[PDB]
Amino acid sequence: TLPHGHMQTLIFLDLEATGLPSSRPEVTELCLLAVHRRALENTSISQGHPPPVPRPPRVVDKLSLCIAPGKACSPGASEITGLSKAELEVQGRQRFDDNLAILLRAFLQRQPQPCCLVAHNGDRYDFPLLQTELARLSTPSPLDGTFCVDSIAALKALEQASSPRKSYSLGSIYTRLYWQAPTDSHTAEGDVLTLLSICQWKPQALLQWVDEHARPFSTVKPMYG
DNA sequence: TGGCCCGGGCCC
Ligand SMILES: [Mg+2]
Ligand SMILES: [Mg+2]
């Protein structure tokens, strides 16, 4: 029933780009939360209604990077992300170069395999967008052995199983489960910490869903190119 | 830009 066995490391991912898929967007900010599967299943059972926001696991590897793009941000993008191509170049931020791929490669190697990526609406944005950026580089994709899932498809499965329309956006799910508001929205590290929290709602059930719906990242159709 | 889900908004 398990195609790739039990995922030993769940790396939560969020991307910030210059615009929408029609804009041919480029990654402006990148964040990764490497969390071991035991660090997740150590999270205590959610008690009371509403249940409190679960604290992040103590043993966690974190990587947040700001990347200067090649094209300017869209009016809507720079508005919500708080990022701009002009300011990034001003602060000497480097492009999405091969040196960044090497950084990602070493960061991923320090994590036990098999490893799975978790992104909100990643199957249709974050994973295809990241797939394109790595394709631009002559350096081989460091994710040829890495797997990935969508937390939107996950949360939809966990909500219908617990409670036999409904908004499944990152902001909506977080508030619906904890009766609170996400801190620092539309920031790479701000959304992953939010993503981790809505994933720590029912960890055992989450890990159970991930191992079944885990698919190779090398099968994700690129956004463009 | 491609799939969801009661063909037009979801979901940077
Ligand atoms: Mg996202
Ligand atoms: Mg985001």
Numbering used by the authors: 5 to 168, 174 to 234
Q: What do the authors report?
A:
Three prime repair exonuclease 1 (TREX1) is a member of the DEDDh family of exonucleases and accounts for most of the 3′–5′ exonuclease activity in mammalian cells. Anchored in the plasma membrane of the endoplasmic reticulum (ER) through the C-terminal domain, TREX1 degrades a variety of substrates to prevent initiation of autoimmunity. TREX1 is, in fact, unique in the DEDDh family for the activity of dsDNA degradation, which enables its participation in preventing autoimmune responses and in restricting retrotransposons. In this work, we solved 4 X-ray structures of TREX1 with representative DNA substrates to delineate the molecular details of the multifaceted catalytic properties of TREX1.
The structure of the TREX1-dI-T-dsDNA complex vividly illustrated the mode by which TREX1 broke the last base pairing in the duplex region. In particular, the Leu24-Pro25-Ser26 cluster acted as a wedge to chisel the duplex end formed by the last G-C pair and the dI-T wobble pair, and the DNA adopted a Y-like structure. The complex of TREX1-dI-T-dsDNA hence provided a first structural basis for the ability of TREX1 in unwinding the duplex region of dsDNA. Furthermore, the last nucleotide at the 3′-end of the substrate formed several hydrogen bonds with Glu20, Ala21, and Tyr129 in the narrow pocket. These couplings to the 3′-end would thus facilitate unwinding of the terminal base pair. The dsDNA of the TREX1-dI-T-dsDNA structure was further labeled with γ-32P and analyzed using 20% denaturing polyacrylamide gels to confirm that dI-T-dsDNA was indeed intact in the crystal.
